[PDB]
């Protein structure tokens, strides 16, 4: 039952793609992006092909890893899989992999770096990242890497959260300083950087590395009191947040000067050094600056995802192989 495939060459690589997808052409460049149009649906579509995805064990595990966290994600605010498909006909002959998604307008780098936002845009693009995050949170997947560049909005400002400007400028300070053991809320820091980006035009934290960042980030927020100190196992660590001169928590309703009051709260809220502290993205959900969009009734959380693989040691060929599998065994989306 398989489709035909037809062959082309777009700049870089060849291409090769079931005759359903349509008037290929390149979006950019981990991979390399076509817009496509989709036959089956009529919807602009995005096609995807790997770069070299058993290049290696990490690249064989990442290809893996990625196809495993696409065929979970389905949600309004999240990045889902339409299709994956490869030209091979057998396992042996396994070499390229292909996936496909909604094309979405443009990205948040590309709406914040035209204007500001107005606090009712901000509100409703927020809230919809909040929501996005609430149901990864949920199945204990944690992004990681939460940025503009990483937030798909198209015409209309729906978001839909996915993977693949600075990296660093959206981290939380607790990753930086390179602690084992950071939890979720590395998520909600990024999004509090990404807020206070929106509403200012300005990037919040423009780090020009890891030191600065840091600087920056405590300029704002103050230094570790007593109570987070106490919980920092690194000696060194510790040593260098104790060194570098103490700076008080700021007022942040007079850092973000005419922002709305309940917006600032939340920004209090999410930007905590502490990350044991930090508002959840279940809990931003219900605070008070989206009471206008917030339904306890439409804010789901996803199946169980099990990411036992992450801990495993494996070939090449058995990364490759596993993903074979998951490539026959994806079963396409409700279509409506
Ligand atoms: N329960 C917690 C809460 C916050 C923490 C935090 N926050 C950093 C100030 C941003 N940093 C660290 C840590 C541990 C080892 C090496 C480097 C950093 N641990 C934390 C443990
Ligand atoms: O995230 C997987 C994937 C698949 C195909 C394209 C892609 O990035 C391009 C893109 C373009 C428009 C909206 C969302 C993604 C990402
Ligand atoms: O990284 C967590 C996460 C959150 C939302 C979507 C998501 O999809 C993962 C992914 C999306 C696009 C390309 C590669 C990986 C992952």
């Known amino acids: 039952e398989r489709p035909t495939f037809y062959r082309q060459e777009l700049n870089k690589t060849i291409w090769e793609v079931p005759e359903r997808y349509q008037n290929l052409s390149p ?20 096609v995807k092909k790997l770069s070299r995805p058993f290049q ?25 899989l339409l299709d994956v498909f490869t030209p091979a006909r057998s396992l042996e002959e396994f070499n390229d992999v292909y996936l496909v998604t909604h094309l979405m307008g443009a990205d948040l780098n590309n709406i914040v770096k035209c204007q500001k936002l107005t ?40 978001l839909k959260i996915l993977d693949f400007v ?12 390179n602690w084992m053991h950071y939890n979720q809320t590395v998520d909600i820091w990024s999004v509090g950087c990404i807020m206070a980006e929106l509403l200012t035009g300005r990037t919040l934290f423009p780090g020009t590395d890891h030191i600065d960042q840091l600087k920056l980030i405590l300029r704002l927020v103050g230094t570790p009191g007593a109570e987070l100190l106490k919980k920092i ?23 973000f000067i005419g922002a709305n009051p309940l ?15 930090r508002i959840t993205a279940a809990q931003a959900l219900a605070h008070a600056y989206f009471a206008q969009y917030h339904d306890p009734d439409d804010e789901p959380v996803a199946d169980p995802y099990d990411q036992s693989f992450e801990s495993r040691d494996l070939l090449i060929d058995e990364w490759k ?15 409506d």
């Open 119 to 158: 606090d009712d845009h901000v509100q409703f693009l927020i809230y919809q990242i909040l929501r996005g995050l609430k149901y990864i949170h949920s199945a204990d997947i944690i992004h990681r890497d939460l940025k503009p560049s990483n937030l798909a909005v198209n015409e209309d400002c729906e």
């Open 27 to 46: 979006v950019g460049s981990y991979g390399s992006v076509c817009a496509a149009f989709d036959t089956k649906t009529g919807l602009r579509v995005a």
């Open 233 to 255: 196992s690194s000696e060194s660590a510790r040593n260098y947040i104790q060194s570098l001169t103490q700076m008080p928590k700021m007022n942040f309703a007079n850092v």
């Open 263 to 277: 917006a600032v709260d939340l920004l209090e809220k999410m930007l905590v050094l502490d990350s044991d502290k």
């Open 166 to 177: 600075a990296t660093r400028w959206y981290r939380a300070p607790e990753i930086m300083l």
């Open 56 to 80: 290696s064990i990490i690249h064989a595990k990442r290809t893996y890893r990625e196809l495993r966290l696409l065929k979970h994600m389905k949600h309004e605010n999240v990045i889902g």
């Open 321 to 335: 192989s596993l993903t074979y599998d998951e490539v026959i065994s994806f079963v396409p989306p409700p279509l």
